[PDB]
Amino acid sequence: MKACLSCHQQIHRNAPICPLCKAKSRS
Ligand SMILES: [Zn+2]
Numbered sequence: 663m664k665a666c667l668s669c670h671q672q673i674h675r676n677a678p679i680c681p682l683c684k685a686k687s688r689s
Contacts (some may be wrong), residue, residue, distance in 0.1 A: 664676060664684045664687055664688075665673070665687060666680060666687050667686045667687040668682050668683065668684060668687070669670070669682060669683055669686075671683075673687075676681040676689065
C-alpha cells in the first residue's frame with residue numbers, strides 16, 4: 663500500500679511504479 667506522489671494515485675500493492683514515482687513516492 664503506497665501512495666503515488668506527483669502522480670495522484672494509491673497503489674494497493676507495489677505495482678508497475680511510475681517513472682516519477684519510483685523516485686518521488688520512494689521506491
Ligand atoms: Zn505514480
